[PDB]
Amino acid sequence: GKLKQRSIKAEGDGIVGEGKALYNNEGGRTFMYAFISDKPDLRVVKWEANTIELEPPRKFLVDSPNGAQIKYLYFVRNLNTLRRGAVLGYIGATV
Amino acid sequence: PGKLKQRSIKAEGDGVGEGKALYNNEGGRTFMYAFISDKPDLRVVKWEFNTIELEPPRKFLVDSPNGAQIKYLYFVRNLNTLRRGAVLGYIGATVR
């Protein structure tokens, strides 16, 4: 199950944050699994004219030249278990 | 979190096989999740420390520098759906 990405703008409350969404283009149709962002407090992503709420950020640290960095993983509302492991499978390969 | 690993090993069947094994490590404790081989239809992966039994292989293709390619995927017996997803999400990135 290959996993793709699409940079997108999310929203918190007064927080408005851009970031990278993880999706899945099975045949013609799309499906967003998770959203990786650097600002917490984020509430909703707007995906397609359709809104998507997010979840309690799980926290972790990803490296780089400019330094390993705090990061915030958001699973979309009620993502089935199998796809959650699938998300963590992708990240913990590209780290 | 986080962190999934790889280590080549030999697996047996009622009959032998060899291939990739996706595994994990925590506070020193070494966990095995899945085994990948081009050969059906093995039973066990022996890990020198247990007789770890394998599920019937799920089957998949990957594109290569020499065309199309068969490999089988064996989850371990009764592996929790969560950890099943990472195996699949990992491979997904890992190969094509």
Element (DSSP H or E) covering residue B68: strand B67-75
Question: Which residues in chain A belong to E strands, given as ranges?
Answer: 4-11, 16-23, 32-37, 44-46, 51-53, 58-62, 69-75
Spatial distance between the Cα atoms of B5 and A92, rounded to a whole number of angstroms: 9
Phi, psi torsion values for B29, nearest 5 degrees: -75, 125
Resolution value, angstrom units: 3.0
CB-based contact B39:B53 (threshold 8 Å): no
Contact A74, A35 (CB under 8 A): yes
Contact A90 B93 (CB under 8 A): yes
Number of domains comprising chain B: 1
Tokens of A45: 């992503």
Q: Residue B2: closest CA among chain A residues belongs to which residue? A: A92
3-class DSSP state of B13: coil
CA distance A34 to chain B (A): 13
Query: A69-75 and B5-12: which strand pairing?
Result: unpaired
**Are the CB atoms for A91 and A84 separated by under 8 Å?**
no
Range of the domain at B89: 4-96
CATH number of the domain within which B21 lies: 2.40.10.250
